[PDB]
A paper describes a structure:
Here we functionally and structurally characterize [name] ATCC 29149 sialidase (RgNanH), demonstrating that the enzyme is an intramolecular trans-sialidase (IT-sialidase) producing 2,7-anhydro-Neu5Ac selectively from α2-3-linked sialic acid substrates, the first one reported in a gut commensal microbe suggesting an unprecedented mechanism underpinning adaptation of gut bacteria to the sialylated-rich mucosal environment. RgNanH catalytic domain (residues 243–723) was heterologously expressed and purified, and the crystal structure of the N-domain with the inserted I-domain (NI-domain) was solved to a maximum resolution of 1.71 Å. RgNanH active site presents the classical features of bacterial sialidases, shared by hydrolytic and trans-sialidases. These include an arginine triad formed by Arg257, Arg637 and Arg575; a catalytic pair formed by Glu559 and Tyr677; a general acid base, Asp282; and a pocket to accommodate the N-acetyl group.
Complexes with Neu5Ac2en, OC and siastatin B, bound in the active site, were solved to 2.00, 2.01 and 1.94 Å, respectively. Our crystal structures of RgNanH inhibitor complexes, including the first published structure of a complex between siastatin B and a sialidase, provide a structural explanation for the differences in inhibition between the chemical inhibitors tested. Siastatin B (IC50 of ∼5 μM) was the most potent inhibitor tested. Siastatin B is based on an iminosugar scaffold with carboxylic acid, hydroxyl and N-acetyl functional groups at equivalent positions to Neu5Ac, an additional hydroxyl group is present at position 3. The siastatin B inhibitor bound to the active site in a chair conformation. Like Neu5Ac2en, the carboxylic acid group of siastatin B interacts with the arginine triad, and the O4 hydroxyl with Arg276 and Asp339. Furthermore, the axial C3 hydroxyl of siastatin B formed hydrogen bonds to Asp282 and Arg257 of the arginine triad. Furthermore, in comparison with Neu5Ac2en and OC, siastatin B makes a more extensive hydrogen-bonding network underneath the ligand via the buried water. Finally, although both Neu5Ac2en and siastatin B form hydrogen bonds to Asp282 (Neu5Ac2en via the glycerol group), siastatin B achieves such interaction without paying the entropic penalty required to avoid a steric clash between the glycerol group and Thr557.
Residue numbers in the entry: 238 to 240, 242 to 723
The structure:
């Protein structure tokens, strides 16, 4: 029979809505997953969103209680039905910080799991982020900048330095203030507190009000004593015990270009290179409104340092979400969304440092604004060939008609970026052409089965906002997918 949720309204997240699936089988056989826990309807930031996470230790069949490894506490986490009328549907939480659009990655060499998300200061999301990195240089060293509450609004005369100590940069001296690994604020070693906000509707009016509950004050919150520059940040935590415990929060977007408005994640999974001289490199897809649209961050030292790469010179700031697969020789093929009405592919022969021009992919119909996709390597040959799988909608209007494709890789006899071709030989229909189908993430489960976590609705449509239980999990055998329609 069926019968298919990981995250759902009423689970331990206390969220009624979810979006932006991520699904990843670990080298051990454990399977994990993540998604946005979108409390305030299915809206993008600005809102209140935490990153949810869950684990399966029976091969991706039974899923435990979800956890929230990236969370903010300025607004309460609760189950609330967001109005779906013509006016209220548009209403968003105004004053909350958020984590949005997750990426999971495993370093198989060290058995470390990384979870990434975009990290949005209170009231911010991509569309209203300010231009700039949010970091300053003090004596040539990058530090997160901070604005003190009694300084002028545009003045950021403070910085977070070693051990979370907050410095006054006009005198170069340590203050009595610091932040811990959540970026919560301390004064002379004592937790700073503020009241939590609640949210409730009265008709179509959204009331954001302080409660009596004290939470930690945090530099990402709307009226904290010190506050960050209001732009998009990239956050990461790692786990050496498959998500039992997590590290302190790393803000890894030190490299955010000063000309950029936002620089954010391509949701899904990252990749570790298996073959060739960059074997072991970890790479994570990004996009921006900047000098470049498509970009990546990579680490040659198992996660300690990250280098930013621009993949193009597009200043359009389209939603160029990408996912990455590896060819047998270790070169990379990236498949990305664009704002141009096709999925595009770009190639790299130097482990992701440089990339070819976009090739429009014509097997798949998509919309003008586009939809995220998922692409993965498969570990067993298919029809005697190395294979990749792609999941995406397939429709010119609307997010619908989801397919899983299988691509078979051949050496063309040519050189470099032209060395392989892919034959999209198979195409499996997940439901039917009229049924909603948006974001998705594939994984290869330990039994060679394919797992899929996906949005079973049109998450772009202003008429399908704020639907519950649309995030759906299914498993397939490879034979089932080998369809030729
Ligand atoms: C960070 C952010 O706002 N990301 C959003 N970008 C638009 C996407 C889409 O469905 O096209 C998602 O809404 C995504 O969360």
């Amino acid at each position: 029979a069926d019968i298919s949720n990981i995250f759902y309204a009423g689970d331990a997240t206390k969220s009624n809505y979810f979006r932006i699936p991520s699904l990843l089988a670990l080298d051990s056989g454990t399977v994990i997953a993540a998604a946005d826990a979108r409390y305030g309807g299915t809206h993008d930031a600005k809102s209140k969103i935490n990153t949810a996470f869950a684990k399966s230790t029976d091969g991706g069949k039974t899923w435990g209680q979800p956890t929230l490894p990236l969370k903010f506490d300025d607004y309460v986490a609760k189950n609330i039905d967001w109005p779906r009328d013509s006016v209220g549907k548009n209403v968003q939480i105004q004053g909350s910080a958020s984590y949005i659009d997750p990426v999971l990655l495993e370093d198989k060499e060290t058995h470390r799991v990384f979870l990434f998300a975009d990290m949005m200061p209170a009231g911010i999301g991509s569309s209203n982020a300010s231009v700039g990195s949010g970091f300053k240089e003090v004596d040539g060293k990058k530090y997160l900048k901070l604005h003190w509450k009694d300084d002028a609004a545009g003045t950021y005369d403070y910085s977070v330095r070693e051990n979370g100590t907050i410095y006054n940069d006009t005198t170069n001296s340590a203050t009595e203030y610091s932040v811990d690994g959540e970026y919560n604020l301390y004064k002379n070693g004592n937790a700073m507190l503020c009241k939590q906000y609640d949210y409730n509707f009265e008709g179509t009016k959204l009331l954001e009000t302080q409660t009596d509950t004290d939470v930690n004050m945090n530099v990402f919150y709307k009226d904290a004593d010190f506050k960050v520059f209001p732009t998009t940040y990239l956050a990461m935590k790692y786990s050496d015990d498959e998500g039992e415990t997590w590290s302190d929060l790393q803000i890894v977007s030190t490299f955010k270009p000063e000309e950029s408005k936002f620089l954010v994640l391509g949701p899904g999974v990252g990749k570790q290179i298996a073959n060739g001289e960059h074997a072991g490199r970890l790479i994570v897809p990004l996009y921006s409104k900047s000098s470049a649209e498509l970009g990546f961050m990579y680490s040659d030292d198992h996660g300690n340092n990250w280098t930013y790469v621009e993949a193009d010179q597009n200043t359009g700031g389209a939603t160029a979400e990408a996912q990455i697969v590896e060819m047998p020789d270790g070169s990379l093929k990236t498949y990305l969304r664009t704002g141009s009405g096709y999925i595009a592919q770009v190639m790299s022969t130097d482990g992701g440092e440089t990339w070819s021009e976009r090739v429009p992919l014509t097997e798949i119909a998509t919309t003008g604004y586009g939809t995220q996709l998922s692409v993965i390597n498969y570990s067993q040959p298919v029809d005697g060939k190395p294979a990749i799988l792609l999941s995406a909608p397939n429709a010119t209007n609307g997010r619908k008609n989801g397919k899983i494709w299988i691509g078979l890789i051949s050496e063309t006899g040519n050189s470099g970026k032209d060395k392989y071709s892919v034959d999209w030989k198979y195409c499996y229909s997940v439901d039917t052409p009229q049924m909603g189908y948006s974001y998705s993430c594939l994984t290869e489960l330990p039994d060679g089965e394919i797992g899929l976590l996906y949005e079973k609705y049109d998450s772009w449509s202003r008429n399908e906002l704020h639907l519950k239980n649309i995030l759906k999990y299914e498993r397939f055998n490879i034979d089932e997918l080998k369809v030729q329609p």
